[PDB]
Write an enzyme that holds these catalytic residues in place. Structure first.
Site, short mmCIF file in Angstrom:
data_model
loop_
_atom_site.label_atom_id
_atom_site.label_comp_id
_atom_site.label_asym_id
_atom_site.label_seq_id
_atom_site.Cartn_x
_atom_site.Cartn_y
_atom_site.Cartn_z
N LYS A 33 76.79 77.40 32.20
CA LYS A 33 75.95 76.72 33.30
C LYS A 33 76.80 75.64 33.73
CE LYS A 33 71.41 78.64 32.14
NZ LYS A 33 70.21 78.08 32.20
N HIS A 54 61.82 75.64 29.76
CA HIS A 54 62.42 76.93 29.60
C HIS A 54 61.78 77.65 28.35
CE1 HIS A 54 65.52 80.10 28.56
NE2 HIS A 54 65.99 80.04 30.18
N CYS A 66 62.41 82.56 33.15
CA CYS A 66 62.28 82.53 31.71
C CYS A 66 61.34 81.08 31.58
CB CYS A 66 63.59 82.46 30.89
SG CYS A 66 64.25 83.90 30.77
N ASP A 93 66.69 68.93 26.29
CA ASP A 93 67.46 69.89 26.48
C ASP A 93 68.07 69.92 27.81
OD1 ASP A 93 67.84 72.43 27.75
OD2 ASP A 93 66.01 73.65 27.69
N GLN A 111 70.43 72.40 32.41
CA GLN A 111 70.44 72.13 33.77
C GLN A 111 70.63 70.83 34.16
OE1 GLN A 111 70.27 74.63 35.85
NE2 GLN A 111 69.40 76.44 34.71
#
Lengths: 405, 405
Positions: free
Chosen positions: A228, A125, A366, A202, A205
């Site tokens: 999220k 991302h 993104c 990261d 997600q």
């Protein structure tokens, strides 16, 4: 409730799921952009503002003690849910993007110099690209990009080949927000440590879709966003190993992060205060704690298995529509099902789907570099969560088919 | 001014401490929320929740409408010429760190001078110290007299051909001093500096017109003006913003990303990296509408009456010394009591139901200037009453007539 998993029982907790779009039922397939909230989260925020609201420091007065209790309990909920050893390793901030910028600016400006190497994956991302580009122009560090095959799998051999004596930092996504690829983060972390680098993961997600244990994982930094994972906007987390945070200087300055201020010199507190400047976002941290408890009640492994069944059902039926190309077919995936349709612009497909009540994003998500690696400017990207149903998937398949015909 | 009708809007004001009614005299730390703000947040999460970009789908369009309307409510309320001059972030502290890291990083170099006042909150001190230590810029501090008034002649004597920035509080959170911001801005501009105004304590207590003030930057926090936590504002004149590079990098602030380089958007997007705190910005817009319905000049007049009523009655208690007796004050009434440490006074007041801060109030330098390490600091808001002030005065006199420490 929720002793046994039942998707209609779960859906009943989410009030927005009864909303209507253009006279049709809403079908929320935009979970990779943001998730919808259980009533308990909404009510936790209302209750805080009506009964607990104050700045913290429990010795001050009664409401300050209530707010302090709730804030500390929320930090502990995060610590427990991600398996951090200590609550002092949990830093509250606005979200994944602010957390990565913290690490980049503070840690990177202290430890990186000319010719040093940062390794990211092609799956990133923009939040895990732009800060490293900024830091690289500021410090002279070199940014290397680990490649993927055309299905979107990270190639572990080429990734290891990029590691060397100049590698100081690896920053890797655990789940691609554009392709859904799950990456082997255990291996990434072990390889990075073998060459002496710190490793940032990261997890924006991954944390909604699979259990997380950062202590077992060993990653030096782990970042995610509350919105999220069924929580309020405006709140996110940087986890950092105690020894990684100790070698990170303060970033933002002001109240709460100082121990003593004189006009000529200030002294700083230890973590977590060291990295939390000014009044924290107390209410939304408390709401995030409620969201974490909701997810724990349902069960993250049950969520993961149910969402996997949704993706396994949807993918072949979508791929069988003439003209459809699935984008991102990694060995392991979570939630995201990008596709394109020959002869139709992604954005027009997204708008037709919205006319059917279905919410998806059509665009670059993104994540322009990974889409360009796939030879594309945009994809249509339904993304599933555990309140989505097979029936909703059927409506979506029929809609795409009618567009293709 | 109908304080009883207003108090009916704030549900937390019905709470009890030790079986006694809560008396909230901690407004300089944070404020309590009207039910309209609480409900606006709930409504957003139940009916409007989505990331923005209205072309995507229905809920995205609802969220975009609400976010744009919140930004326009802020612009209207502070008298900014353009919505593009309004930057959303977490609070005053983040806003000042934005100006210090990004604008200051570009424009404050070796030998360049920064002028702040002795009244500053730590939020308007530490970012300038950190920048100064990075670049060799010189930090100067304009003095006050024993009453807490800013000394305008000495302030002007600090300005010269190397002054790049003046950063001044409009209202001191520890003393309540109102500074002459029009004079400060005009003087700074005359000597060639940009001027940042810390409005965290002025915006809830007096009308703000930033276009008429001419300040280059103006900062405030939502939770001190009856709004949600986690939201605040940086206003910057468009020419000042035009010369400010981006601070945090990621989605929303980019226009295009390749692995080689990223191009940036214009403002406000340029300065908002990642998913914004949409919900709390919406709630802050609701808070602004509440304040606007009541009328900021009526609020200012009523609160001035409260402070005027309280100050002589508190000052008449044997043992009590008032800290901060400036020519113009808003809200704050610091004091000390002979034979008692401030924190013990705060705890005793809490036993009576009264919430105040006892400590250094994140303003150690001004308190050292007053000869003190801490004060007891009630601070008034327009839902407070003369009756509550009478309870407070009687509790202080009981503490003074009791046993010393």
């Amino acid at each position: 409730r929720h002793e046994i998993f039942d998707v209609n029982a779960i859906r009943a907790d989410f009030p927005i799921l009864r909303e209507t779009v253009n006279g049709k039922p809403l079908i929320w397939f935009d979970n990779a952009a943001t998730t919808q909230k259980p009533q308990a989260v909404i009510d936790r925020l209302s209750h805080f503002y009506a009964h607990e609201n104050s700045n913290i420091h429990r010795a001050a007065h009664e409401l300050a003690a209530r707010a302090t209790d709730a804030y500390e309990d929320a930090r502990e909920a995060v610590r427990r849910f991600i398996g951090a050893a200590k609550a002092e390793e949990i830093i509250f901030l606005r979200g994944t993007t602010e957390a990565i910028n913290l690490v980049a600016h503070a840690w990177g400006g202290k430890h990186l110099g000319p010719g040093d190497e940062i390794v990211i994956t092609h799956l990133e991302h923009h939040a895990n690209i732009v800060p490293w580009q900024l830091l690289s122009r500021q410090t002279g560090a070199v940014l290397k990009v680990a490649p993927v095959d055309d299905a979107g799998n990270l190639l572990l051999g080429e990734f290891e080949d990029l590691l060397g004596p100049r590698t100081k930092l690896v920053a890797a996504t655990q789940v691609s927000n554009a392709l859904g690829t799950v990456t082997p983060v255990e291996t990434i972390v072990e390889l990075g440590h073998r060459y002496g680098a710190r490793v940032l993961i990261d997890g924006a997600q991954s944390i909604p879709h699979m259990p997380i244990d950062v202590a077992a994982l060993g990653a030096d930094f782990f970042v995610f966003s509350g919105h999220k994972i069924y929580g309020p906007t405006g709140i996110g987390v940087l986890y950092g190993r105690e020894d990684a945070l100790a070698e990170t200087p303060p970033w933002q300055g002001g109240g709460n992060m100082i121990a003593d201020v004189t006009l000529e010199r200030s002294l700083y507190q230890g973590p977590p205060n060291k990295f939390e400047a000014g009044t924290g976002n107390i209410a939304d941290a408390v709401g995030l704690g409620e969201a974490i408890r909701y997810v724990e009640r349902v069960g993250i492994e049950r969520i993961a298995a149910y969402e996997h069944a949704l993706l396994e059902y949807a993918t072949p039926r979508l791929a069988a529509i003439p003209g459809v190309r699935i984008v991102g077919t990694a060995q392991e995936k979570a939630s995201v099902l990008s596709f394109v349709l020959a002869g139709h612009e992604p954005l027009e497909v997204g708008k037709a789907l919205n006319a059917e009540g279905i919410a998806v994003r059509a665009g670059h998500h993104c994540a322009q570099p990974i889409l360009r690696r796939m030879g594309l400017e945009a994809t249509v990207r339904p993304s599933f969560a555990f309140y989505n149903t097979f029936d909703e998937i059927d409506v979506f398949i029929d809609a795409v088919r009618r567009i293709a015909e």
